[PDB]
Symmetry: C2
Subunit: 74 residues, 2 copies
């Protein structure tokens, strides 16, 4: 239903990314606060479509030290 992305890594790095993502606020529906399994930190992003998700990923520069995983929700 809804395409999602998980960005996993350094909490500080994720905080910087969320800051940078504000420059492309129309490229995603929502971005979460930083969470963890309870270790690395994780941020979840939701999108309006697979196209928007790819437009977002094609425009934002994500460090190689951050793991990008894609998925879908209902």
């Amino acid at each position: 239903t809804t395409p999602i992305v998980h960005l996993k890594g350094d909490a500080n790095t994720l905080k910087c990314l969320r800051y940078r993502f504000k420059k492309h606020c129309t490229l995603y529906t929502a971005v979460s606060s930083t969470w963890h399994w309870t270790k690395s930190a994780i941020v979840t992003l939701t999108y309006d479509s697979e196209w928007q998700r790819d437009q977002f990923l094609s425009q934002v520069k994500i460090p190689k030290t951050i793991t990008v995983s894609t998925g879908f929700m209902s």
Copy 2:
């Protein structure tokens, strides 16, 4: 790849659920800290398979006030 679930609602309710979930720790791979879009609160759970996800949902009692959504990650 990996089946996931999002439990959305009252942070206090989610905290109680995480406490109760510890009684069925083998029914899930991991459960997250409570996060939010940045409003309701959300907890993410990951599983080893669709079967485990259903075994988990068939055993835990989740309040009707909590929205349960399913999805998958890579």
